Amino acid sequence: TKVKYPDGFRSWYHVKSMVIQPGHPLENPFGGIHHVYANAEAIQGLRGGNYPDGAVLVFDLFDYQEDNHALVEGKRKLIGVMERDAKRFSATGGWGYEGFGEGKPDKRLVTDGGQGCFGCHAAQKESQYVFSRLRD
Amino acid sequence: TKVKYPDGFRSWYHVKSMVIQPGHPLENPFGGIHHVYANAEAIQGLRGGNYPDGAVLVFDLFDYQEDNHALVEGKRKLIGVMERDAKRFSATGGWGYEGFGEGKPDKRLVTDGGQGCFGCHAAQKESQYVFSRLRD
Numbered sequence A, B: 001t002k003v004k005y006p007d008g009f010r011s012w013y014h015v016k017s018m019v020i021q022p023g024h025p026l027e028n029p030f031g032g033i034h035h036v037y038a039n040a041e042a043i044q045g046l047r048g049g050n051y052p053d054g055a056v057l058v059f060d061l062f063d064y065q066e067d068n069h070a071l072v073e074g075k076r077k078l079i080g081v082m083e084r085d086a087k088r089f090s091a092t093g094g095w096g097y098e099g100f101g102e103g104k105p106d107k108r109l110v111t112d113g114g115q116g117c118f119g120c121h122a123a124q125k126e127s128q129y130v131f132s133r134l135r136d
């Protein structure tokens, strides 16, 4: 009943990126440059189909440094993970929610079985609880 | 002596990103959010191997909007392309250089066999003309 670490996620498909700066309500703790990646199964949900079991989205969050008005990636703060399993993750709408401190497998951040994540992600019920959209 | 449009580059390996904002010496023309992509042959050279002919690196440049302490991805401005060929492109260090306005195959921007591109990239002779470094 626990989200698997997504080995190899960095070689997956880059869906989009976004910068959250100090002052944004999500500053704590999602401030930084983030990138979104999807495995093959997730791409099919993003492309319009149903999300099948085994679908995985990753939120890869980096700290950054203003240097002469360029934003430069520094150290990874965390990764957030959504793993699709309609049965096993029934409780949180078919996705399991987990965090890994610094992207390391041994550093789970979620302490409430994922209801905090789901609390906010539920507003996107219309789109299967995913906020990101494929762009070209 | 003509660089191919790199079809399907969006499904390649995401190397890194960087934001260049108003003030920085490079806003004109490189202002915005950029992402770097590499095909298989380029990874070998990024990893510390040599670059095989057929290695391609892409710079994907997006405009951005300020949205409540977030920078959000807008329109693609252009892609820049480096295509590895030591014989075909010996005039510019064995890489071809080209740009496509708004990433469209028909909007070739480069008019000087890529000398303009190459005079800045030559600062990086020692890294074989590539500024990007792999990260985790």
Ligand code: HEC
Binding pocket: A016, A017, A018, A036, A057, A058, A059, A080, A081, A082, A097, A098, A099, A110, A116, A117, A118, A119, A120, A121, A129, A130, A131, A132, A133
């Ligand atoms: C609102 C207060 C949120 C909470 C709490 C959590 N997330 Fe979230 N998440 C939110 C937004 C607005 C976005 C989109 C960012 C963008 O670039 O558009 C996301 C994104 C993710 C993703 C990527 C997939 C997607 O839905 O777009 C993942 C994998 C993700 N978030 C995971 C996640 C986890 C594990 C959380 C609890 C630890 C969590 N999120 C909380 C908004 C909110």
Ligand code: HEC
Binding pocket: B016, B017, B018, B034, B036, B057, B058, B059, B080, B081, B082, B097, B098, B099, B110, B116, B117, B118, B120, B121, B129, B130, B131, B132, B133
């Ligand atoms: C200095 C005035 C530059 C000119 C002119 C051009 N480029 Fe460039 N390029 C420059 C930098 C500092 C970087 C690194 C960006 C980063 O985030 O690190 C790059 C990068 C590229 C890349 C990506 C591969 C790499 O070398 O890191 C490509 C594919 C690339 N540049 C292509 C390119 C082309 C086609 C140019 C002429 C149209 C061109 N560059 C000009 C600096 C400068």
Ligand SMILES: [Zn+2]
Binding pocket: A023, B069
């Ligand atoms: Zn404010």
